[PDB]
Structures are given as C-alpha cells and as structure tokens.
Amino acid sequence: AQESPAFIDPASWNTPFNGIAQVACHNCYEKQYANTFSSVLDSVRTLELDFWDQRDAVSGGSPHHWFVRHNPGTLFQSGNDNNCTGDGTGKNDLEACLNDVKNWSDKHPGHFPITLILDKKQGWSKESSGRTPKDFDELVARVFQGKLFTPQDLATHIGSGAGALQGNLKGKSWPTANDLQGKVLLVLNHSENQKLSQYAEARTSKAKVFISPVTNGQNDISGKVSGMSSQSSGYVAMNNMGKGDKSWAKQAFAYSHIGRVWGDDEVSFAQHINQKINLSAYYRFAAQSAGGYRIRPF
C-alpha cells in the first residue's frame, strides 16, 4: 500500500525519481526549523543533517561516531545541537538522527523514498580514529540495513558500471518512486569537493552514499569535476548548487543527475520546477507548495 499524504501529487508514483521535483528542507535538524527531526516527515521526504567529527573544531571525537550541529562550537556540552531523539540529554548524535528516519520508515510501509542530505563539516579521519569513509558506510548500513538504495543499485538499473554513472545516466531513467517505496537514499555534501573525491576513491562501487559535488560549471556535471579525480568524477549522479549556481540544474536534469538547489528561499516552488530543480531546499519547507503539492513531476 503506497502512502497518500496530501502533499504528494499521485502522478509522482509512476515517474522516474529524476523526473520528480520536491520541496526539501534546509538544515531541518535545527530546533528553529522543526520541533523534532521526525516531524519534518509530516511535510517533505528530503531532509538534511550537518555532521561533525569533533565536539568542537579540534577535539572530542570518538570512533564510529559523529555529532550533529550547525556551528563549529556549541554551548551544549554534548557537542550536539539538534532536534533529534535525545535532544535534552546530549545523546542526540548522528546515529540518533539516522535512527529517527529509520524508525519513521518502519512505521510507514510504502512510503515515498526518503532522501537524506548528509552535509559533512570536517575532513575524514585515518583508520585509527574510526571515522574513515568505510566507517561512515558501516554506520549508515548498520542503521538502515536493506532500506538503502545506493549508487551500485542505480548503476545496475541503467546497465552501467558505478564508476560510469556520470555520463551513462544521460538519456536514462532512475527507478520510479513506486519502485523505490520504502527506500532511503543517502547523499554526501561538503564545501570542498576533495572530501567527496576521497570518499569515492575509498569506497568505489561499494559506496552506501551518493556523492553530490558543489557545481558551478558544466564540468562539475559531466567533466573532470572541480576538486576531484577522474575516477571520482565518474561516480557523480547528483549535483549540489547554491542560489548563484542554480542555472546548472537544467544540465543536471539533462544528465539525469539529481540536482539540489539551496539558498534560494525567495523563489517559489513552481518557479523551481520550471528551472528543472529536483530538490529545492527551503528553511521554511512547510510554507512551500505548488497547487497544494510539495512533491510532483516536472
């Protein structure tokens, strides 16, 4: 039984995922934007977590653990400042926030696929510190288990190697929202494409997470991506654009890469749909809609 909340246009279900436009949150883990992280799923199906290795900028990390907060430092002695389960006791870490999504998914069989933007704020560790790309994949896999849909799954769907998604996606359809019912898609962002390139080089076709580089030219979609190796560029199936770079969403769309645009809150959802944006990130997500919908086909 496919879910039927009013904000989903039912035409979405038989549309390839790359042909669907969504209202997404921007930084909805912050208390100012929602009372609980779980509540965000009352309004949208694309969420975001900002995650840190250390308790402040320089200290306090532990293996196989990351903190969730906006700023390099917080007055909360826990190193967490967010609306996930544990908010009020300091136990509201990345794993807790991921578990909020997992638990919501278990309670809503047949849900529209959930996309989580994981906005990484520090560099990767080496093996001894327990926060490598492999450790990150192990965490997300432990939490979500078989809920995940990964780059290799997409590559199989389109008949490509995962390291040739970049160009082989052009002209192809992702699975439909119906095909993806009950699934979770994880996306890695960082201000520096080098950290995405480090992730992809480490994980290759085993990656649990889609990389989505900062995009401000054609080459960041289909060429040697700024800040990345050739190898890492080939795994790109998603692209991340700030407001000033949103014209590139039309080329993400052309390449069947999932484009996200953030920072463009004064522009309507309907306008963003005309601009071929898959994921339009809004701080005030519940206030956005087009003809009553927050998810609809282009």
User: For binding to Ca ion (CB under 5 A), which residues are involved?
Assistant: 27, 50, 119
| CB neighbour list of residue 53: distance below 8 Å, 6 or more residues apart | 61, 66, 67, 122, 123, 125, 131
Spatial distance between the Cα atoms of 30 and 37, rounded to a whole number of angstroms: 8
Q: Which is nearer to Ca ion, 145 or 191 (CB)?
A: 191
Instruction: Show the DSSP H helices in the chain as ranges.
Output: 94-107, 133-144, 151-158, 165-168, 193-203, 219-222, 230-233, 249-254, 269-274
> What is the token pair recorded at 162?
């995962």
Q: Which is nearer to Ca ion, 49 or 290 (CB)?
A: 49
Q: Which is nearer to Ca ion, 119 or 220 (CB)?
A: 119
Q: Which is nearer to Ca ion, 159 or 244 (CB)?
A: 244
For the chain, how are helix, strand and coil distributed in percent, rounded to 5? 35, 15, 50
CB atoms within 10 A of CB 38: 18
Overall size of the chain counted in residues: 298
Spatial distance between the Cα atoms of 146 and 166, rounded to a whole number of angstroms: 25
- Residue 103 and residue 173 in contact, taking contact as beta carbons nearer than 8 Å: no
Q: Which is nearer to Ca ion, 32 or 128 (CB)?
A: 32
State the minimum distance, in angstroms, from the CB of residue 177 to Ca ion: 25
Task: Give the SS3 label for residue 260.
Answer: strand
Q: Which is nearer to Ca ion, 119 or 135 (CB)?
A: 119
